[PDB]
């Protein structure tokens, strides 16, 4: 209950899927052309059984100029531009890309994937063979659960490009209006009646970010899977609005324990769906809450779990 960084240690039994950042670190070592080929390979195979949802119209508008610029290049330049993004080179295209929210980056690559499939953007060279390190990285990816697979792909996409400056322009999709109160569903969590946890889940499922943020302490933090804590209401609300639209949280069961100084620690396990895959991918998730004596959220961590065997009382 003293520091955000120490609260990171609550529920230390929770086995997170650290194969995801491990695999991202291996991927990030590879030659840029192998990075592009590997994801092409993974994308094609995954597309045999899982269809990515189409990017939103606003997103496509925001990426359109950059996409047109690439589409106007000769093939060798197209390949160089994509390598620039993978290498995190400092170029105008890489700076534009870095200014984008994850969803806009994902929609940019969604479009390039379609154009490569159609032959209008320089495809991976025919008969391309991955490097020794890259073939093993792909093998690991293809052995993971789909929820882990899609998280590796997102993290590879978000990592590309070049950030120059701390207070650089941030481009994101417009904020969706919250769900009308009448049509809202309420979660049920075995073992957990805590109103702050239930209101957390219900407000996020309704895209009601202004209500959600009011659950937090001023200095409170939210820790997304495999990322550092996002600290204080402005940064956490920013994150909700830019990155947390149209999720479906399906918490199942939890446990509630006292913590030092009248705090309460609560662990919930369940599933989450991203709007990119809808009901076809259910990620296995834990939430770890540290609530102050008044019930506000001092800290919440969201963990991608190593296996369904990490869900409480499987
Ligand atoms: C790149 C590339 C390509 C294309 C690649 C493409 C098109 C790849 C596309 C990949 C896509 C669309 C991946 C989407 C992933 C989404 C995830 C993991 C969302 C998780 C959300 C969670 C867990 C949120 C949970 C949350 C909960 C519960 C909270 O309680 C609080 C909020 C929080 C957010 C934390 C080509 C194919 C063209 C080849 C070349 C190449 O490189
Ligand atoms: Cl998402």
Author numbering: 2 to 315
Lines quoted from the article behind this entry:
The I1 dataset with 1 min illumination reveals s-trans to s-cis CAN isomerization along the C9’-C8’ single bond concerted with s-cis to s-trans isomerization along the C7’-C6’ single bond (s-BP isomerization) as the early step of activation (d and below). As a result, C8’ = C7’ changes its orientation. The refined coordinates obtained from extrapolated structure factors identify the CAN s-BP isomerization after 1 min of illumination at the experimental light intensity as a first light-activation step. In the I1 structure, no changes of coordinates are observed for W110 compared to OCPO but the Y44 sidechain undergoes a rotation by 31o. As a result of Y44 rotation by 31o in NTD in the I1 state, the distance between the hydroxyl group of Y44 and the C9’ carbon reduces by 2.0Å, redistributing charge-density around C9’-C8’. Leucine L37, which has been proposed to play an important role in OCP light-activation, does not undergo any significant movement upon illumination. We therefore conclude that the s-BP isomerization of CAN in I1 causes rearrangement of the CAN β2-ring binding pocket in the NTD, which is mediated by contact with Y44. The salt bridge rupture between R155 and E244 is already observed in I1 and increases the distance between residues E244 and R155 by 1Å. We complement this knowledge by showing that salt bridge rupture between R155 and E244, the important precursor of NTD and CTD separation, occurs in the first illumination step (I1) and is controlled by a hydrogen bonding network involving protein-bound water molecules. The I1 structure is the first example where s-BP isomerization of a carotenoid carbon chain regulates the activity or the biological function of a protein.
Orange Carotenoid protein (OCP) is the only known photoreceptor which uses carotenoid for its activation. It is found exclusively in cyanobacteria, where it functions to control light-harvesting of the photosynthetic machinery. In the active state, following OCPR (red state) binding to the cyanobacterial light-harvesting antenna, the keto-carotenoid dissipates excess absorbed light energy through non-photochemical quenching (NPQ), a vital process for cyanobacterial survival in turbulent waters.
